[PDB]
């Protein structure tokens, strides 16, 4: 299946040229970019691993693309996302996050169902990749 976290995952995988234009758009607004990796695709896995620090002072999109492609060479198989952070009062939060790399095959998830009280079901979303192998060897 296709992991559809990220804001462009109903579109084809973005080319490097398309990614650069999105980065250019984020930096035009004064947003800080960073790169993050995980091989736990769970929807509640908030904290993907940081690829260095966010690039607060960087002004040229090419430097973001440089770090993205260094992350791609170094990280294990899995997911990479690129985020844009707006530190302005009233936001102080991420304002853009999209997937730039995904594994060749994602088995996805199943729904574990525990019998609760009455008719209630206690749900757990379980990742096939994570239950099978440790971090760094999942894909």
């Amino acid at each position: 299946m296709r992991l559809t976290q990220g804001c462009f995952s109903f579109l084809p995988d973005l080319t490097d040229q398309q990614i650069e234009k999105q980065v250019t758009y984020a930096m035009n607004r004064g947003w800080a970019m960073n790169v993050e990796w995980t091989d736990d695709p769970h929807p509640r896995n908030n904290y993907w691993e940081l690829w260095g620090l966010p690039l607060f002072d960087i002004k040229d999109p090419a430097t973001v693309m440089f770090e993205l492609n260094e992350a791609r060479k170094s990280c294990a198989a899995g997911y990479i996302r690129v985020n844009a952070f707006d530190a302005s009062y009233g936001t102080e939060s991420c304002v853009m996050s999209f997937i730039t790399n995904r594994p060749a095959n994602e088995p996805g998830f199943y729904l574990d169902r525990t019998e609760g009280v009455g008719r209630q079901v206690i749900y757990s979303i379980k990742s096939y990749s994570v239950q099978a192998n440790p971090e760094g060897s999942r894909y």
């Binding site: 299946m1 804001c7 462009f8 109903f10 579109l11 084809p12 758009y25 929807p43 102080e92 939060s93």
Partner: protein, 481 residues
């Protein structure tokens, strides 16, 4: 004879009727204080009524005055508590209509109580005989009063963090038909729509608990559909479970049930009223729940330009009360929505402060005192062929809801959801790349381009391309830019 001897004989407090403008409620020299509550009324006096006297009458009967002099004023710091009409301007391109600014002392109002604020500002003056029509257009709620209110339970920022969704508008859909579906079929529609790409679905505003579907049946089945779609996509998913009910006890029962089963969100209807709304906004913060407000009934007083309450005021009251979403218009859908008015509503809901912006209907500068931002919801008669217009008018932080525009798809609910999401992401991608997407020769082309590789979107564009809702607005601006 003691009552005769002690009768008050002053100009202001001898018994009898004197004009409100002579009772202290008119002062053109008044200096507004940062702590004052300010109100802007559009006043249409009855023929022969002096416009300043009408403004002073509104100011008096919404603060401390009645129709005849009372000596008990003298037991109070009466000067301090009188509201002051301080500015009366003619409305542009009208003959007998005025804009009246009125200032109210901070101490008139119970802290954190929307019911008390409205009891004064809108309680009685709209029925006053001497005024033929009255509309509350705007209010300056002072920083010191705002800090007594919670503001949104969650707010736009934390909402997107809870959903892990950043960079595009959010997507939703009302389940249809409005009434009649069983709980099991409700969960099916919710499952199909979420799996097909929507972030949310929602109960219709009139779906509460009924013979054809009792509310617990709907909640349990919808949670099965929600968790199924989350495991099928790897995304956080939800559906606005409607907890609107007859009594506060029943509202709380439905809210607690939604929380116990793990719903990220509940919805409420404005017809429940301000006291229930404030109670459930506090509850939503205390119980980690997103709180969606459907504005049921709003247009009974917000539709006409001559009388009622402008929706931008409702926006302030509901952001103060603390809902996380409020329906706020589409411009291009089936419900009334002048674009300048709509853009003003969205600013009221989303900005950290307001600047005077008369073409948008923003008559007061106003800091929002770091009350969290409320998420506008655009819903009603819209379809993915309008996506370039929605992105242009409504911006990034909004939920675009497609009920008929999802479930009406000939190839099924999943296909309808997929068409809407592809249109949204393609439009945002092109916007970010620099396209002049709002132009009718550009926006529609971006969608046609994406449709070349998305069957569901091509089908949706084919079906609804010619559908528009072009009618003259009733709620319109008074100033051009």
């Amino acid at each position: 004879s003691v009552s005769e001897r002690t009768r008050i004989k002053s100009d202001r407090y001898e018994s009898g009727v004197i004009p409100y403008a002579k009772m202290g409620y008119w002062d053109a020299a008044y200096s507004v204080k940062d702590t004052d509550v300010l109100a802007l009324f559009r006043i249409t006096p009855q023929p022969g009524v002096d416009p300043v006297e009408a403004a002073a009458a509104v100011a008096g009967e919404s603060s401390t005055a009645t129709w005849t002099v009372v000596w008990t004023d003298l037991l109070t710091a009466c000067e301090r508590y009188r509201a002051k009409a301080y500015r009366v301007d003619p409305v542009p391109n009208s003959t007998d209509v005025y804009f009246a600014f009125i200032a109210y002392e901070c101490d008139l109002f119970e802290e954190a109580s929307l019911s008390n604020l409205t009891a004064s500002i809108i309680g009685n003056v709209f029925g006053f005989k001497a005024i033929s029509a009255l509309r509350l257009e705007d209010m300056r709620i002072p920083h010191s009063y705002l800090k007594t209110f919670q503001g949104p339970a969650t707010g736009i920022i934390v909402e997107r963090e809870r959903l892990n969704k950043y960079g595009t508008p959010l997507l939703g859909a009302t389940v249809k038909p409005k009434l009649g579906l069983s709980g099991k079929n409700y969960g099916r529609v919710v499952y199909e729509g979420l799996k097909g790409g929507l972030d949310f679905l929602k109960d219709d505003e009139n779906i509460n608990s009924q013979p054809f579907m009792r509310w617990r049946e709907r909640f349990l089945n919808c949670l099965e559909g929600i968790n199924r779609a989350a495991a099928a996509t790897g995304e956080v998913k939800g559906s606005y479970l409607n907890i609107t009910a007859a009594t506060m006890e029943e509202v709380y029962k439905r809210a607690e049930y939604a929380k116990a089963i793990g719903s990220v969100v509940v919805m409420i209807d404005l017809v429940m009223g301000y006291t229930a709304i404030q109670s459930i906004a506090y509850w939503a913060r205390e119980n980690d729940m997103l709180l969606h407000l459907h504005r049921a009934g709003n247009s009974t007083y917000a539709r006409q330009k001559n009388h009622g309450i402008n929706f931008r005021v409702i926006c302030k009251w509901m952001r103060m009360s603390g809902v996380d979403h409020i329906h706020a218009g589409t411009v291009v859908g089936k419900l009334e929505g002048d674009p300048l008015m709509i853009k003003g509503f969205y600013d009221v809901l989303r900005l950290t402060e307001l600047e005077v912006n008369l073409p948008f209907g923003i008559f007061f500068e106003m800091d929002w005192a770091s009350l969290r931002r409320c998420m506008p919801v655009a819903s009603g008669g819209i379809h993915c062929g309008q996506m370039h217009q929605l992105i242009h008018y409504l911006g990034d932080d909004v939920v675009l809801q497609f009920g008929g525009g999802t479930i009406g798809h000939p190839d099924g609910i999943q296909a309808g959801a997929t068409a809407n999401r592809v249109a949204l992401e393609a439009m945002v991608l092109a916007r970010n790349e620099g396209a002049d997407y709002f132009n009718n020769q550009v926006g529609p082309q971006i969608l046609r381009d994406a449709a070349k590789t998305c069957g569901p979107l091509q089908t949706a564009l084919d079906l609804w391309k010619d559908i528009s809702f072009n009618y003259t607005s009733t709620d319109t601006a008074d100033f051009a830019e």
